[PDB]
Each structure stands twice: as C-alpha cells, then as structure tokens.
Amino acid sequence: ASPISTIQPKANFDAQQFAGTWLLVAVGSAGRAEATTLHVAPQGTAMAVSTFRKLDGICWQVRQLYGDTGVLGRFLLQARGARGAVHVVVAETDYQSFAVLYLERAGQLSVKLYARSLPVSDSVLSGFEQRVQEAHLTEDQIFYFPKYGFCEAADQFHVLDEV
C-alpha cells in the first residue's frame, strides 16, 4: 500500500551509532531552504530528534520524537493533530559519514540525504541521486540545502516542542 513500506530499512539499525549530529544535504521531493542540522538521541527504542534551522540570522529549534513502529529503522513522527503522520525509514547509512532517509506524508514519498560533515563523497551523492530516480522523482525535484549558516542552538523564545 504505502510507498515507504517497499523501502528496506537499514539492516540491524543501531540508534546508538546513529546518535549525534547530522547535516541535511539534499531532499528529493514532489511537494527558501535553510541550513539544517539534526541532533539525534536514543530514547528507549525511539529517537529524540531536535532540528535546528537558521532563519534570517536567528536559530530555531524544533523538538520531536521519532517513535519506534516495531520494525528496526522505521519510525513515526506523530500526527501532530494539525498535519498528517509522517513515517520515516533510515534506509542506508554507515553511521560515520552519511545517511539516506525516506519520509512519507499523505502517501507522498520523499528522500533526504544527511552527512556527518561536508563535503559529501561523490559516491554517496551519486548513490542518493540514484535512489531519488528509483523513487520516481526527477533531478529537478532534488533541492540542495545550504552548505553554510548552520546553527545548533536556540534560545527559549525559538524552541518548539512537539513532544
């Protein structure tokens, strides 16, 4: 049924090795990109995820909980009430340099490439592109995010807790 159910999650996904900071490199989607950083922390079998984005010089933080859906590597971003549930799968990753995640919102699949640091190896970028094509998305539906202007901390007036 769901497009994401056909994607295989990382074999024996290990939240402990996936923990830490991840930088958003690009997103393949059919739906201004800000420098985005992810801070991941295991929480039981789920993962506490904070996302930091620099908006007009100001750093914003959003706290979310990637709930465990039973299959290792597959998570669920709670139907926030206002906006559908988001299914997430960590498909491929070596934990030490890159990670390819797939997201599904309202039956629509998207693919995101994350890196531990820049630059991303040519091999991984091509691999990501190969995966976007296979997901039936075009080269024009790939959005590259900023390689500068990242932020990883916000003050109390710019924190949105969705947990």
Swiss-Prot record:
A single cellular component GO annotation? plasma membrane
Chain's role = Component of the membrane attack complex (MAC), a multiprotein complex activated by the complement cascade, which inserts into a target cell membrane and forms a pore, leading to target cell membrane rupture and cell lysis. The MAC is initiated by proteolytic cleavage of C5 into complement C5b in response to the classical, alternative, lectin and GZMK complement pathways. The complement pathways consist in a cascade of proteins that leads to phagocytosis and breakdown of pathogens and signaling that strengthens the adaptive immune system.
Under the subunit heading, UniProt states: Heterotrimer of 3 chains: alpha (C8A), beta (C8B) and gamma (C8G); the alpha and gamma chains are disulfide bonded. Component of the membrane attack complex (MAC), composed of complement C5b, C6, C7, C8A, C8B, C8G and multiple copies of the pore-forming subunit C9.
List the Gene Ontology MF annotations in alphabetical order: retinol binding
Q: Does the keyword Secreted apply?
A: yes
Principal localisation: secreted
The family classification in the record reads: Belongs to the calycin superfamily. Lipocalin family.
Question: Which biological process terms from the Gene Ontology are attached to this UniProt entry?
Answer: complement activation, alternative pathway; complement activation, classical pathway; killing of cells of another organism; positive regulation of immune response
How its function is modulated: the record gives:
Membrane attack complex (MAC) assembly is inhibited by CD59, thereby protecting self-cells from damage during complement activation. MAC assembly is also inhibited by clusterin (CLU) chaperones that inhibit polymerization of C9.
Q: Which cysteines are joined by disulfide bonds?
A: C59-C151
In which compartments does the protein localize? Secreted; Target cell membrane
Could you list this entry's UniProt keywords, alphabetically sorted: Complement alternate pathway, Complement pathway, Cytolysis, Disulfide bond, Immunity, Innate immunity, Membrane, Membrane attack complex, Pyrrolidone carboxylic acid, Retinol-binding, Secreted, Signal, Target cell membrane, Target membrane
Tell me which species this is from. Answer: Homo sapiens (Human)
**What sections of the protein cross the membrane?**
none
Protein's UniProt name? Complement component C8 gamma chain
Q: Determine the domain of life of the protein's source.
A: Eukaryota
